[PDB]
């Protein structure tokens, strides 16, 4: 709980390039066979996103600013990292956001949490009917003064461990609009070893959070007690900026292309 892992250390912040990453549906407005231009918090094309990793003797969980917006890109197989916790001071002095994904629903609670030095989610007994479900919660000791609570709709996710190159891909975009939060999510399989693939994708909305708090910082929840180490997984952290997308709409409404000019 309050004792960091023996393998926890600061890893080198490598950088990579996100080809089309950062494109998402702006709102619920539908258009087809037209070219629309909008301006919101976006991830620039051909930018530099920081390269993070975790293995069975290196572990890193840095805290990064949420002020300008952050893009999430997770290249994983068994989906080890289950979400994030958002907060300003990251203590019980103010409110904190709790996002936990059990691969069934999404538990969203805004309360006053007491953060342990190294939050952890208990997982064990992998022999019969493992399911990769959480058991012990080392994240917070106590909770009170809850101003918000939410439970999403059920879905399906593959938590089974695999060998070889990475398979699953989860792309999240979290932003702050006039105090209210908007959640974007997409899940598609890919073939990846290291870096990022060359391709295009469009992110669908997920949950609209009418919370209304201010969050200057965030940390990563992983692995989902000093001798306990983390599995093999990788996730990425981007920085959102006020860009302008030119979107292409097909006959079905799916975005087949996006163009953001400040480069060429």
């Amino acid at each position: 709980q309050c004792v960091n892992f023996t393998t926890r250390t600061q890893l080198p912040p490598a950088y990579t390039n996100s080809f089309t990453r950062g494109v998402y549906y702006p709102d619920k407005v539908f258009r087809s066979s037209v070219l629309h231009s909008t301006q919101d918090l976006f991830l620039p094309f051909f930018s530099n996103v920081t390269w993070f990793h975790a293995i069975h003797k290196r572990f890193a969980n840095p805290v990064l600013p949420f002020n300008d917006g952050v893009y999430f890109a997770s290249t994983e197989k068994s989906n080890i990292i289950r979400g994030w916790i958002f907060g300003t001071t990251l203590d019980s002095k103010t409110q904190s956001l709790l996002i936990v994904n059990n691969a069934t629903n999404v538990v969203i609670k805004v309360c006053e949490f007491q953060f342990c030095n190294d939050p952890f989610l208990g997982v064990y007994y992998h022999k019969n009917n493992k399911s990769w479900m959480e058991s012990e919660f080392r994240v917070y000791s106590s909770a009170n003064n809850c101003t918000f609570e939410y439970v999403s709709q059920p879905f399906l996710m593959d938590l089974e461990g695999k060998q070889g190159n990475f398979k699953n891909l989860r792309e999240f975009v979290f932003k702050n609009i006039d105090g209210y939060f908007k959640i974007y999510s997409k899940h598609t399989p890919i073939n990846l070893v290291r870096g990022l693939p060359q391709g295009f994708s469009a992110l669908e909305p997920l949950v609209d959070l009418p919370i209304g708090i201010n969050i200057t910082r965030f940390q990563t929840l992983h692995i989902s007690s000093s001798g306990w180490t983390a599995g093999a997984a990788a996730y990425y952290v981007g920085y959102l900026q006020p860009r302008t997308f030119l979107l292409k709409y097909n006959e079905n409404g799916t975005i087949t292309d996006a163009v953001d000019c400040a480069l060429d």
Binding site: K28, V29, F30, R31, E204, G253
Partner: protein, 306 residues
């Protein structure tokens, strides 16, 4: 229409030719209103229909927010003995949106139903539960006589009679007379307990977390009507199309960024929005010295009335 040409040209003699004397537009026949599904919302049965309550001084406050409040069950069911609703009628309750709603559940005696008013005194008013002078709330009462009543008095509420001083409005004193007052059903209608729930209303600059009135009518297609589904008002023709919308996408747009379609907030369907027929009125007539015969020409529209 022969004089309409004289009215447009501002002359008593009409020259031979075609002239546009006016424009025509078809008015909407009726109004179509559809709202998202109102079934299986968050009810009030937790505070109202609960098995056991707290006492007058032990009253609990439930926070009602981020849900839909249905106030039609209160007055229309006629299952409640009496109610006092201040500043608004029980019908205006459903027609307004509130920022925060609080429910204070407690059980008082029979003669104490008149002792709940803004700015009043009494046994439970000063010593237990008091209403401020500015209180705009709406309270409803009903009989507990067949449930909360027990032979020899109920020891759950205890009805604390005495206190050394008076309590401020909306002040809960749980400090542990008594000496519990008899709740036995054998007493008359004045000494029998009634269930009273006080509704506290708050209106602030923050957006209202409570939802207003919900009403829906039948849906009609291939006619000019006034359509409002939860997001937009307008007049046009509603026709179901083969378009496919994403489940999180509602309104569509044309090439001109005008909304050409709308999805039903309740059921699953997609109907295009076509503006109602309109055009100019063209009058075809010969000269004034020829004849009075005229011909009305509707521009770019088929005539389905005749």
């Amino acid at each position: 229409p022969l004089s309409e040409t004289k009215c447009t040209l501002k002359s008593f003699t009409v020259e031979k030719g075609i002239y546009q004397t006016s424009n025509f537009r078809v008015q909407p026949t009726e109004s179509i209103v559809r709202f998202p599904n109102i079934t299986n919302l968050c009810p009030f049965g937790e505070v109202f229909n609960a098995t056991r309550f707290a006492s007058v001084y032990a009253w609990n406050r439930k926070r009602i927010s981020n849900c839909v409040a249905d106030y039609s069950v209160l007055y229309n069911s006629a299952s409640f003995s009496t109610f006092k609703c201040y500043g608004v009628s029980p019908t205006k309750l459903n027609d307004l949106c509130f920022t925060n709603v609080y429910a204070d559940s407690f059980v008082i005696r029979g003669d104490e139903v008149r002792q709940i008013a803004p700015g009043q005194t009494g046994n439970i008013a000063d010593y237990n539960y008091k209403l401020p002078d500015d209180f705009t709330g709406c309270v409803i009462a009903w009989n507990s006589n067949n449930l909360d009543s027990k032979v020899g008095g109920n020891y759950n509420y205890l009805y604390r009679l005495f206190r050394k001083s008076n309590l401020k409005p909306f002040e809960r004193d749980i400090s542990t007379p008594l000496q519990s007052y008899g709740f036995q059903p054998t007493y008359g209608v004045g000494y029998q307990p009634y269930r009273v729930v006080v509704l506290s209303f708050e209106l602030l600059h923050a957006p209202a977390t409570v939802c207003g009135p919900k009403k829906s009518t039948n849906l009609v297609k291939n006619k000019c009507v006034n359509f409002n589904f939860n997001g937009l008002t307008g007049t046009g023709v509603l026709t179901e199309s083969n378009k496919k919308f994403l489940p999180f996408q509602q309104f569509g747009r044309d090439i001109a960024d005008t909304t050409d379609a709308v999805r039903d907030p309740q059921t699953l369907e997609i109907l295009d929005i076509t503006p109602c027929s309109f055009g100019g009125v063209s009058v075809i007539t010969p000269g004034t010295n020829t004849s009075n015969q005229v011909a009305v020409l509707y521009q770019g529209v088929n005539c389905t009335e005749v």
